[PDB]
Amino acid sequence: SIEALMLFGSAARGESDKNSDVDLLAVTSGVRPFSKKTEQTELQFLNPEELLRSASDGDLFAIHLAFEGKIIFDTTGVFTRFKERLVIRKDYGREIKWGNDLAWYLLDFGMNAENTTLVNKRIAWCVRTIAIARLVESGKIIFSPRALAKEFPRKHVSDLIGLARSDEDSQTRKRRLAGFLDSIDSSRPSVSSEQEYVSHFERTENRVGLQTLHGLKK
Amino acid sequence: SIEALMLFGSAARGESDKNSDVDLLAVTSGVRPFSKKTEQTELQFLNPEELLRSASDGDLFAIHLAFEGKIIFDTTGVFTRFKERLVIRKDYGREIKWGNDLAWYLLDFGMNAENTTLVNKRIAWCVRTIAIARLVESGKIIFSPRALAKEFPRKHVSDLIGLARSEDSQTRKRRLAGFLDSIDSSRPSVSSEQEYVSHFERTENRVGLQTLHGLKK
Amino acid sequence: SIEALMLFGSAARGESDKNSDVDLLAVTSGVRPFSKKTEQTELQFLNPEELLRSASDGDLFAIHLAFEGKIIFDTTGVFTRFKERLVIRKDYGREIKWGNDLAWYLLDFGMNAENTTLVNKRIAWCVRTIAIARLVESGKIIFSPRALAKEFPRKHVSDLIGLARSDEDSQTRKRRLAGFLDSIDSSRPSVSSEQEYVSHFERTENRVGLQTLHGLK
Amino acid sequence: SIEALMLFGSAARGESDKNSDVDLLAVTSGVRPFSKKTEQTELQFLNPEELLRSASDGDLFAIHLAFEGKIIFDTTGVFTRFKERLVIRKDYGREIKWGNDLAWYLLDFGMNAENTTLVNKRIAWCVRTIAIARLVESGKIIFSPRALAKEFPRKHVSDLIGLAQTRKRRLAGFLDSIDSSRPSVSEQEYVSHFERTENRVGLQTLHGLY
Numbered sequence: 097s098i099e100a101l102m103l104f105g106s107a108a109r110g111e112s113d114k115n116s117d118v119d120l121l122a123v124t125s126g127v128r129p130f131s132k133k134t135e136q137t138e139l140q141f142l143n144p145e146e147l148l149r150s151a152s153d154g155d156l157f158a159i160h161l162a163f164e165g166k167i168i169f170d171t172t173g174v175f176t177r178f179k180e181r182l183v184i185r186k187d188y189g190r191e192i193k194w195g196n197d198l199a200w201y202l203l204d205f206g207m208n209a210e211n212t213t214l215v216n217k218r219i220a221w222c223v224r225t226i227a228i229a230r231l232v233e234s235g236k237i238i239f240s241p242r243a244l245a246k247e248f249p250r251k252h253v254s255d256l257i258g259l260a261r262s263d264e265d266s267q268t269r270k271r272r273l274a275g276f277l278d279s280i281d282s283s284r285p286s287v288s289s290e291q292e293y294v295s296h297f298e299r300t301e302n303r304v305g306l307q308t309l310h311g312l313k314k
Numbered sequence: 315s316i317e318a319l320m321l322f323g324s325a326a327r328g329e330s331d332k333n334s335d336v337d338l339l340a341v342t343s344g345v346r347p348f349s350k351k352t353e354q355t356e357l358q359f360l361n362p363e364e365l366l367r368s369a370s371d372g373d374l375f376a377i378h379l380a381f382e383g384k385i386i387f388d389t390t391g392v393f394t395r396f397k398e399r400l401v402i403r404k405d406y407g408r409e410i411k412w413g414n415d416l417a418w419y420l421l422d423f424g425m426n427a428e429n430t431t432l433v434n435k436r437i438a439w440c441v442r443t444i445a446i447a448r449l450v451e452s453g454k455i456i457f458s459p460r461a462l463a464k465e466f467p468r469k470h471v472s473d474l475i476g477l478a479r480s481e482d483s484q485t486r487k488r489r490l491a492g493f494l495d496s497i498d499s500s501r502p503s504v505s506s507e508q509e510y511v512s513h514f515e516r517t518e519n520r521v522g523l524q525t526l527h528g529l530k531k
Numbered sequence: 532s533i534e535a536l537m538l539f540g541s542a543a544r545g546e547s548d549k550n551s552d553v554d555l556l557a558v559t560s561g562v563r564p565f566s567k568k569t570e571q572t573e574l575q576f577l578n579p580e581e582l583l584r585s586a587s588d589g590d591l592f593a594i595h596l597a598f599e600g601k602i603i604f605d606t607t608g609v610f611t612r613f614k615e616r617l618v619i620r621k622d623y624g625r626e627i628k629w630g631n632d633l634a635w636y637l638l639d640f641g642m643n644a645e646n647t648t649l650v651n652k653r654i655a656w657c658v659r660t661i662a663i664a665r666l667v668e669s670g671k672i673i674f675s676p677r678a679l680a681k682e683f684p685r686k687h688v689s690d691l692i693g694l695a696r697s698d699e700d701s702q703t704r705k706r707r708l709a710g711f712l713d714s715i716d717s718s719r720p721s722v723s724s725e726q727e728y729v730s731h732f733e734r735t736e737n738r739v740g741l742q743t744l745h746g747l748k
Numbered sequence: 749s750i751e752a753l754m755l756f757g758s759a760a761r762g763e764s765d766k767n768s769d770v771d772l773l774a775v776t777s778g779v780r781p782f783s784k785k786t787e788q789t790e791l792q793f794l795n796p797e798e799l800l801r802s803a804s805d806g807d808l809f810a811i812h813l814a815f816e817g818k819i820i821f822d823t824t825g826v827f828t829r830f831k832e833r834l835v836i837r838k839d840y841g842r843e844i845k846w847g848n849d850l851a852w853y854l855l856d857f858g859m860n861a862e863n864t865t866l867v868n869k870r871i872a873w874c875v876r877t878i879a880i881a882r883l884v885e886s887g888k889i890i891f892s893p894r895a896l897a898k899e900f901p902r903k904h905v906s907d908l909i910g911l912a913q914t915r916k917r918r919l920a921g922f923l924d925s926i927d928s929s930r931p932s933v934s935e936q937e938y939v940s941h942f943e944r945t946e947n948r949v950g951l952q953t954l955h956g957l958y
């Protein structure tokens with residue numbers, strides 16, 4: 097069964113934009129994490145242990161749930177134990193490195209891939225993650241696209257996050273992503289071939305990078 | 315887009331158990347009415363015009379949304395315009411007869427159908443529709459399966475409504491016949507499955523037409 | 532200890548304005564009903580037994596809590612037993628008659644009273660009670676001032692309810708209350724003076740009439 | 749006039765006991781901060797500019813509202829602008845010092861004062877402000893009395909905070925357990941100390957006679 101249900105995302109902030117979705121977190125035991133999208137809705141499924149682990153580890157997403165989430169119902173108090181476990185870290189350089197390195201892979205290999213929508217979705221994930229992580233290190237808790245652009249005013253932050261649900265395949269994405277990486281003083285990881293990025297993602301445990309690279313194939 | 319979102323059903327009452335689903339209503343403009351079931355969740359999609367019509371027509375489901383629904387968000391105020399349009403009727407005999415007639419068909423043809431799940435679900439619909447309507451007529455707003463059996467205490471109400479969540483099969487026909495007796499029900503003047511199709515079309519029993527043709531699939 | 536808190540009124544409808552208050556209902560065990568107003572906040576205190584009684588008696592205020600109230604927290608489920616006990620009556624002529632009789636007393640004696648604020652509050656109470664009850668009798672659940680004037684289109688409904696928080700002493704209030712009473716085919720009860728209004732309110736169990744009458748003095 | 753309403757405190761955590769209150773925050777334009785207490789309810793009134801200031805200055809109480817408060821309604825979106833302005837400070841030693849100095853004053857002079865109630869309220873504030881400051885510096889967000897004693901397990905932490913006879917023995921036992929140092933101060937030198945260190949709560953308490 098489903099122990100608890102939380103509204104998060106822009107709907108929990110009372111904000112909306114052109115193609116906004118509705119974000120719902122369903123806590124149910126004995127299931128591996130997954131999500132289902134259905135006509136502008138998004139259902140995120142987590143088991144209770146994974147929810148508590150994200151708080152103990154100080155996941156940026158866990159910070160969002162505790163900062164802006166709204167409980168719809170909670171029959172087990174799992175969201176209370178979730179907030180009790182939350183430990184906000186002082187250093188998110190690991191998350192910054194993941195978004196940094198995947199941005200370089202997408203720059204080197206993603207701009208002509210067939211799955212344009214996945215590239216755009218994950219280009220935004222890179223810029224979003226770096227912006228969220230850098231702001232938390234500075235003592236701020238920011239998650240909305242409009243506020244990330246104002247609080248982390250690097251080159252093309254708004255444009256690149258705006259790709260999150262776009263099928264835009266213009267080559268101006270490559271020039272803008274390169275300008276953003278330059279504005280944050282990014283350096284490409286010591287890799288070249290696609291196979292080397294795979295090994296580097298494994299070495300640095302960049303799960304989203306591995307999922308993105310493999311997902312672009314088919 | 316999605317203007318408003320409402321939690322309804324047993325979760326909105328804090329009465330979810332093990333077999334319970336999670337009921338969510340999403341108001342989206344332009345979409346045709348449909349539902350989607352995903353891992354114990356049920357998403358109901360309506361356009362604003364359809365939502366207001368159910369209020370003006372005093373639909374039993376609309377009374378549930380207005381009485382027990384818990385608004386999660388509503389950017390357009392559509393739920394307020396929904397409640398201002400609500401007109402509870404003093405007479406729900408039309409809805410009562412729809413469930414009464416379909417109950418007779420399921421008693422006469424559904425007890426040995428292949429799709430046992432659909433028959434069990436639609437048997438629960440007949441009993442629940444009748445219980446809800448009778449209680450609204452007396453001035454009560456009741457929708458919990460447990461409270462429907464206490465406030466509408468007819469024979470086997472809890473057992474038959476429980477058939478949606480499914481059990482003592484092959485005694486269902488006896489329990490359904492017992493319920494039809496306790497409500498002083500009468501079978502409509504039909505005696506063929508085609509005569510049931512004809513009766514459902516005259517009386518505009520859409521749930522019956524869907525049920526009958528759904529058992530053939 | 533406060534076991535449950537509910538938001539009601541216009542804030543729960545998402546349509547409060549600059550002149551609105553914030554309506555909060557607090558349930559505390561072993562306490563008699565009373566109200567405390569604080570910097571445009573209104574705190575209503577009830578015990579669980581009084582709350583559930585208003586549902587069983589079908590109080591018009593209880594209908595509002597059930598169809599428009601939003602729970603802030605509820606550690607005892609008292610709002611769940613509240614809704615299970617609700618019984619909407621087919622007739623509210625008693626509440627209508629209470630509002631009519633008090634309106635006539637204010638018209639006959641209150642238009643030059645010292646406590647103008649109390650008179651303006653209870654004038655709005657009379658018209659609101661009558662409008663709410665009539666709309667409930669017709670199967671509708673209306674409570675906001677704007678919708679009451681639209682759904683109960685009688686003379687000066689909007690103006691008279693607008694006196695709720697007004698210190699206006701103009702005699703135009705008296706002419707408007709008379710025009711309203713004439714539009715609902717109201718008739719003054721067979722009472723001569725102020726003492727006969729007292730004996731009438733006591734005989735007819737008009738608690739609000741007795742409270743208002745002695746409130747001016 | 750009231751544009752936003754928020755529930756905070758233990759009721760927002762669903763952890764109210766027999767002696768709890770109901771904490772409500774009302775944002776009202778053009779008012780000075782003040783609070784009304786009505787039959788176990790606590791209404792706190794703020795203007796939007798003051799609410800955003802507490803976020804920009806990283807007030808401990810602002811962090812509580814952002815991570816634990818439950819919005820009842822918000823007609824202006826001020827709570828989102830409130831959360832956008834939040835800047836968690838890298839250090840809260842200033843707050844810890846304020847609570848430490850006042851505790852030493854109350855230990856040296858307030859254990860037999862007339863207003864026994866006010867002494868118990870400010871003593872709890874000292875221990876609570878110190879505990880909450882530790883929790884924020886460590887990245888935690890649950891400011892309940894049980895969480896404070898659990899995460900800050902010094903002697904008699906739950907006893908002192910639980911003060912809303914034996915009070916002196918356990919207050920000194922707390923200062924000893926945290927290796928606290930009394931500031932170099934008489935009761936008149938405690939005044940000159942709070943004034944120099946800008947301990948507002950220490951000033952208003954001593955004159956008692958978020």
Ligand SMILES: Nc1ncnc2c1ncn2[C@@H]1C[C@H](O)[C@H](COP(=O)(O)Oc2ccc(C[C@@H](NC(=O)[C@@H]3CCCN3)C(=O)O)cc2)O1
Pocket residue numbers: 119129130131138140155157217218221303304307
């Ligand atoms: N821990 C998280 N971190 C970052 N954001 C998260 C997290 N949880 C939920 N969200 C939000 C919700 C919001 O809606 C946004 C959509 O944007 P996103 O680009 O999908 O971001 C990601 C989404 C999921 C993952 C986890 C997993 N991938 C997947 O399960 C599927 C498989 C194909 C498509 N993804 C993985 O690789 O480990 C990683 C990134 O994601």
Ligand SMILES: Nc1ncnc2c1ncn2[C@H]1C[C@H](O)[C@H](COP(=O)(O)Oc2ccc(C[C@H](N)C(=O)O)cc2)O1
Pocket residue numbers: 358373375435436439521524
């Ligand atoms: N008008 C409503 N009456 C009762 N319930 C409704 C209604 N609308 C939505 N619901 C949800 C809430 C609950 O979950 C209930 C259980 O479903 P039921 O199957 O028992 O009852 C139905 C069977 C058929 C239909 C027709 C629909 N076009 C379809 O093709 O299905 C509709 C309902 O359905």
Ligand SMILES: Nc1ncnc2c1ncn2[C@H]1C[C@H](O)[C@@H](COP(=O)(O)CP(=O)(O)OP(=O)(O)O)O1
Pocket residue numbers: 104105106107111112113115116117119156157160221224225228239240241260
């Ligand atoms: N890369 C990331 N790292 C950590 N947390 C992240 C994240 N991306 C999103 N989040 C968090 C915050 C979102 O508000 C929230 C929903 O993520 P989302 O993809 O739905 C974007 P949202 O803020 O809802 O605006 P909208 O376009 O849908 O209207 O999940």
Ligand SMILES: Nc1ncnc2c1ncn2[C@H]1C[C@H](O)[C@@H](COP(=O)(O)CP(=O)(O)OP(=O)(O)O)O1
Pocket residue numbers: 322323324325329330331333334335337374375378439442443446457458459479
């Ligand atoms: N035949 C009918 N006529 C009018 N309204 C009806 C209805 N059947 C259900 N409803 C209303 C009320 C349900 O609570 C609500 C959800 O319908 P549901 O099928 O999910 C049964 P529920 O009350 O949620 O308990 P559970 O077994 O899921 O835990 O939809």
Ligand SMILES: Nc1ncnc2c1ncn2[C@H]1C[C@H](O)[C@@H](COP(=O)(O)CP(=O)(O)OP(=O)(O)O)O1
Pocket residue numbers: 539540541542546547548550551552554591592595656659660663674675676
């Ligand atoms: N005479 C009556 N009979 C039955 N119920 C009555 C009632 N008067 C008020 N109510 C119910 C409904 C109000 O919305 C609700 C709050 O009553 P209220 O006096 O605060 C008027 P409200 O609807 O909130 O608009 P606003 O002027 O404050 O912006 O209490």
Ligand SMILES: Nc1ncnc2c1ncn2[C@H]1C[C@H](O)[C@@H](COP(=O)(O)CP(=O)(O)OP(=O)(O)O)O1
Pocket residue numbers: 756757758759763764765767768769771808809812873876877880891892893958
């Ligand atoms: N000295 C301080 N510095 C910063 N923040 C402080 C604070 N004292 C209290 N807070 C925050 C957190 C409380 O939950 C809340 C105070 O509310 P409260 O003083 O009523 C204690 P509470 O946590 O609600 O439990 P209970 O005893 O009422 O049941 O506001």
Ligand SMILES: Nc1ncnc2c1ncn2[C@H]1C[C@H](O)[C@@H](COP(=O)(O)O)O1
Pocket residue numbers: 540554566573575592652656
């Ligand atoms: N029984 C009842 N009737 C109407 N309003 C009620 C009642 N009980 C509480 N209230 C609340 C609702 C109003 O906002 C307010 C004005 O009541 P008023 O009596 O108009 O001064 O007091």
Ligand SMILES: [Mn+2]
Pocket residue numbers: 105106107116117118119
């Ligand atoms: Mn979203």
Ligand SMILES: [Mn+2]
Pocket residue numbers: 105117118119138
């Ligand atoms: Mn999303």
Ligand SMILES: [Mn+2]
Pocket residue numbers: 323324325334335336337
């Ligand atoms: Mn359900």
Ligand SMILES: [Mn+2]
Pocket residue numbers: 323335336337356
């Ligand atoms: Mn359902």
Ligand SMILES: [Mn+2]
Pocket residue numbers: 540541542551552553554
């Ligand atoms: Mn009001």
Ligand SMILES: [Mn+2]
Pocket residue numbers: 540552553554573
């Ligand atoms: Mn009021």
Ligand SMILES: [Mn+2]
Pocket residue numbers: 756757758759768769770771
């Ligand atoms: Mn409190």
Ligand SMILES: [Mn+2]
Pocket residue numbers: 757769770771790
């Ligand atoms: Mn308090």
